[PDB]
Design a binder for this molecule. Sequence first.
Ligand SMILES: *[C@@H]1O[C@H](CO)[C@@H](O[C@@H]2O[C@H](CO)[C@@H](O)[C@H](O)[C@H]2NC(C)=O)[C@H](O)[C@H]1NC(C)=O
Ligand SMILES: *[C@@H]1O[C@H](CO)[C@@H](O)[C@H](O)[C@H]1NC(C)=O
Lengths: 584, 193
Amino acid sequence: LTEENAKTFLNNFNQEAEDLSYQSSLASWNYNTNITEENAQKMSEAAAKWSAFYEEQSKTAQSFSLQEIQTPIIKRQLQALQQSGSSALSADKNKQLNTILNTMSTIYSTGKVCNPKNPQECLLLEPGLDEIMATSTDYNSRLWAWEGWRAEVGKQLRPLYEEYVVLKNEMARANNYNDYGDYWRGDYEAEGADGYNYNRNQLIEDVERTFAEIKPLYEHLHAYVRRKLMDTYPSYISPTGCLPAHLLGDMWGRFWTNLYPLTVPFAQKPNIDVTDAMMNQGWDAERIFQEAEKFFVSVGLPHMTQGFWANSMLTEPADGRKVVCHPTAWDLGHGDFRIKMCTKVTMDNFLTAHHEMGHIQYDMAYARQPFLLRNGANEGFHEAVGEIMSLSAATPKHLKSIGLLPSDFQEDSETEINFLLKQALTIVGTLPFTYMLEKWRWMVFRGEIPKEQWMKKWWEMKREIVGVVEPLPHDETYCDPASLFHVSNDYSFIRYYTRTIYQFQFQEALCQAAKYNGSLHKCDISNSTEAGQKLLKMLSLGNSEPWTKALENVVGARNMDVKPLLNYFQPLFDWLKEQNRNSF
Amino acid sequence: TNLCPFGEVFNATRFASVYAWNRKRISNCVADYSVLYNSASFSTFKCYGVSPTKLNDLCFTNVYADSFVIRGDEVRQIAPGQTGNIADYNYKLPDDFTGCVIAWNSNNLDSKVGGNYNYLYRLFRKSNLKPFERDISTEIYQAGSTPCNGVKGFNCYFPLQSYGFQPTYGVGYQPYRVVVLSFELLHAPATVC
Ligand SMILES: *[C@@H]1O[C@H](CO)[C@@H](O[C@@H]2O[C@H](CO)[C@@H](O)[C@H](O)[C@H]2NC(C)=O)[C@H](O)[C@H]1NC(C)=O
Ligand SMILES: *[C@@H]1O[C@H](CO)[C@@H](O)[C@H](O)[C@H]1NC(C)=O
């Protein structure tokens, strides 16, 4: 009692966890720098030790029953440590259960797939050549080259998954909850006082009423793309059926390697050749990054550590000395705060740099709330922080006021359309996918009927939503969420959903307090301290205060608000709305 | 003429811990303070109630030198009318005291690769420590689920933990080397000047 046993157990938890996390981060660093596979063996050993020790902590969480009489603030930590997690179960069941996902992944890296009936340009499905060997608009020699590939993958995915889904039902039966689908959403509850509890089904009540009034947003998007496909050659869209799905190259709807260039219908305006005109100056990776601190001295945020600029790895290799190059920012535990990205100099390199720059500044805000709140405060804000600053820095007037772009070339009123076409494209085509997918994902593990009737209704749903169909349907040898390294391995998938809304919420939050007349698109970041002052306090909250109470105090928000998103582009939605009356 | 060797005390070889530290005696010596004033190597040389110019002219019967190592952030938290884990369970200063505190940085010497775990800390005690405390006893913490009779049950666990040290840590958590000067006046003659 008197919160000494809990304090001491949690402090020992903090010490051991910091040591283990620092060891694991150091092992990751040594692995990605001096790979020898015994560093990876020690990685596995330390991870197994950490897991077993954490399971013992979960067992020792049976140390004090709670009931209701207490009203402390440490109750969040109490339930976090008492969380069952992967604990319990027989030592035989989960011991073979955890040996499934890794051995599933082995059939992917060892497989070799290249151009069929073409010994030339034959190479593995890797992004080095995939961009040009897959995302090319070809019709005759591409139709039958992917059915075989996606039937070869799905040869054993149905028989494996039909047992996998029922074998994971053991965690559903011993998770102290009732349904595996609701297990994920059962950890989002935020209560600090009466009237600020999160209702489990608040989403299904509020969002679904508002989804009806936004219908015309989607039907007319299809009328835009037909301005190009129907214009060139009269063999893409057959009148009997609907538009094809193979020539696009990516059914995931994330990147467009050929739609993006040929996007503006008029194509008379001059594009931007900034990189060609700036390569002569000498702006390399080290010469680039100074913009962040030049902004932040005007804002007031703390500078980076000596190790931050001592650990860059922005130099070219000598001869073919490749490494694992991916966007990865890590906390690395006890105040390390290191960024790792081996980047060259390109135009999109600017869009890269700020995006992971935001992560470390956001992390350097809640370091005073131990390891209890050093975790991610919210699943959506983590990427929103990285992307909001970047999109704001993407302002042409921002990039002109520094002294680089001549004032003779004044800004125009039609190029913002070209700027924002892809920005409004990439973050709009995913929301219906995710909303259908997550709810029906929680529906399908109930198993009312196996999966040989859902695909039939899938096509009817798609036709009544957008009207997409292929002339000769395939057989049942597929699984959409299976061939994905970020889905099959069971990560958080609403994290690719939430980031669209909160960025616009915070952009509106700044633009309503930026004291700017005229339009609402000319919001600029430089030379502003009040915004940073009001922002740092929100960053430095963590799991201490519910987001509901925080948003109430800031502006008033019981739930999500998308009408900022609607009204921030409705003055630009005239083109999508009124010019599209001659088609359905 | 006949100066008191502060250098061997400061630039030592084997270093003191925070839970087993011992006093150092200064008697029959001469004071040389301009070196400290213009040392030019001082992380935090701040102290109130004494002025360095006239500190040369002051003489005291007994002088105790205290040196220890703590986390860089809490170097200024050691003061009268202060709190914290170190203040309440590891080391506390009398409020009436009016000496001076000096901070150094020893990353180039103290730290190493591998997280030197020799340095420790004493957290477990039933109460707060009286000022100027030194004990070798390790009295049983009165927390016996039922007996703590050397049995690992409830509230009975290992009380000693480490403090890792690598150069990769942040500046605020780098090990700072801190020395404490004790000043007091005794009726006995003051041969230290
Ligand atoms: C990474 O650093 C090590 C440190 O010397 C380099 O040499 C390895 O050292 C370990 C430990 O002494 C030996 O067990 C290995 O046999 C050494 N050679 C290796 C791992 O190839 C190592 O060469 C460095 N790695 C790279 C890629 O430069
Ligand atoms: C202590 O630091 C170094 C290491 O011994 C030494 O060279 C220096 O002269 C000393 N500082 C003094 C004597 O003030």
